[PDB]
């Protein structure tokens, strides 16, 4: 060469800030059945990172992921919309739930990608399982189609950009020739910043909860009442538990569940709970009578 | 309201970091400025679950107050582009983001009724600080008074909180695997409730102690309604029935004990007979440990 | 360095054939960068052009920097 050839390798990343994620993930769970898709808003920083700084939804219609409810002028109308609002914004990707099962793409989830791909060069499709996702770390991949044409050409081996790896597998169904023909794994980020944290931290108005209330004291000696009767029932099941484990060996002791009432656990259960309450329902008593005094 | 048409203003987090990206779009030279856009919501009982909103192109004198703009026209296009993607969403107020009121916000609020009656503020902050929660909601009521003055457009405060669904918990959750909150258990918990309320009261009470200050001396000319209220608060103090109280107050605590003092015994016994396990399963370990 | 080269070359051309796929390229080419540090050997170069030209964009990168 007397001049550069043609360039690829990255560590490609996407940084979704905590305001897109709640969006992507609710109005994805909106659509379980007939998931949903959306465009991404933001900005794409140098070449190794893009920024989702927000989305918004598309309309559909009512069989799947139709494109003739991806209007054209759905997303122009949009676009200047926000930008009357104060978001210098451009598309940067697109993405959708597959709702229960594995973050992968589909032959027509592949092939609209590649509309993406004419239309603009950059483009990362950003995949939520709302169901899955559910409590955790929030299953949430980013792919991107490659040239399978040039992998038959010899390339196969030359569509390996610098990118830094975990593996994965459920989805190795189409990802054998997903992550190795048809796209990629992108990396996930966020960026937790100290205001919003410092917000979704808020979850509890208690200048008018406990402290400033107790529950009431005919509400709560019915409540002592029950508990300490049960312990009565526990107790005498224990004397009965406590001359078994003596004889028995621990393997006998160990698949015993059949009546979990009868060990301590049932003891412990119950005295955490009483306890709690009492104490504490003890000292709220004590600290409203020097605070109101 | 005099109605049970509302009363819990419940708004999910997507919400708020919704008006805290909002607050920085405009924020360039145009910060320092209430900031306004109308809540998306749906609801059917005395509860106005709000879900959605967008910023709404909106201008305001700073130093005038009939001078304020607000492209209602914007708002009937939006409006539409949202239902078109989720049925179910009428507009159920607007929000506004504080610090806190203005004499202006009545205007508004006719502005934006002209398309849904009972639309309520929803006052966020931009700045953490507050202990409590950063959403007071208000209602535009109007009613008569005593003293004969013309019926007014005020703005009656009603109960506040946010809640969540599934998706919005587990958002949460995962932004705050920083700041873990978890750690801490049950009865901790509890005591936390009950000193970080006394902060509530302690700065509620000392703003009404400021206030009186400001009406006595450097005058603010008096309300004689805040005064009224002030004096139920002193006559409903417990104290008058003061000997007997003393009595039972004590009975009730001696209760208390009795089932704490079993409690804590149950515990113990259960506790040693776990360590009688330990110690037999130590000689059995040890019958191993020789061997060959 | 020069002249008490010690070392088998016989080791080097068992993992270079063995794992010439992807990254492993890269690695390869520096394993050479310290198996001949300072006895100034290039004969993994002169005699095996083939792998600069499969080298990668970033191959050609650790592939000139091994002569440094």
Redesign the interface.
Known sequence: PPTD?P???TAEQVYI???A???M???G??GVPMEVMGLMLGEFVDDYTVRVI?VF???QSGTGVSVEAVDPV?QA??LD?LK????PEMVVGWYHSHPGFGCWLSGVDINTQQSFEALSERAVAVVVD?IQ??????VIDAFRLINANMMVLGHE??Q?T?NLGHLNKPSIQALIHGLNRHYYSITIN?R?NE??????????????????TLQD?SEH?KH?ESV?KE?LELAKNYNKA?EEEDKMTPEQLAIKNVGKQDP?RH??EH??V???S????????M?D?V??K | MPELAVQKVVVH??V???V???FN??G?VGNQKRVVGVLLGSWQKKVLDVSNS????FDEDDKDDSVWFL?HD?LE??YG?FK???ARERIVGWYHTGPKLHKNDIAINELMKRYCPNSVLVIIDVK?KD????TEAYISVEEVHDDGTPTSKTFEHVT???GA????????????R??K?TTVG??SQ??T?????????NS?LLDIRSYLEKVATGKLPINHQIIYQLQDVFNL??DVSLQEFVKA?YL??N??MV??Y???L??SV?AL??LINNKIANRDAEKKEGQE | LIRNNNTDLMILKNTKDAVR???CHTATVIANSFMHCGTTSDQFLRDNLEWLARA???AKFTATASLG
């Open positions: 050839a360039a690829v390798d800030s905590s305001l994620l709640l969006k993930l609710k109005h769970r909106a927000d939804a598309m309309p759905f109308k949009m919309m009357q609002t104060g978001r709302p996702s559910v409590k955790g770390k929030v081996p030359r390996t610098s966020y937790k205001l919003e944290q410092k917000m979704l931290l808020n979850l509890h108005k208690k200048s008018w909860m406990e402290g400033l004291y000696c002592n300490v312990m406590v301590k003891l412990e005295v955490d009483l306890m709690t009492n104490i504490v329902q003890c000292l709220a008593a600290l009578t605070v109101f | 987090p997507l708020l970091l919704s805290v990206d909002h779009r405009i360039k967008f910023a709404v192109p492209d914007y296009n939006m582009m078109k993607v989720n953490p202990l409590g929660l950063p506040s909180e946010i669904e599934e998706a919005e918990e587990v958002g949460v959750e995962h932004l705050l920083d700041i909150d049950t009865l509890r005591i409730n009950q000193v970080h309320g006394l902060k509530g009261l509620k103090l417990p107050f009730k605590t209760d208390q089932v704490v079993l409690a804590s149950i515990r259960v007979h776990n | 796929n992807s990254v990668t964009n970033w």
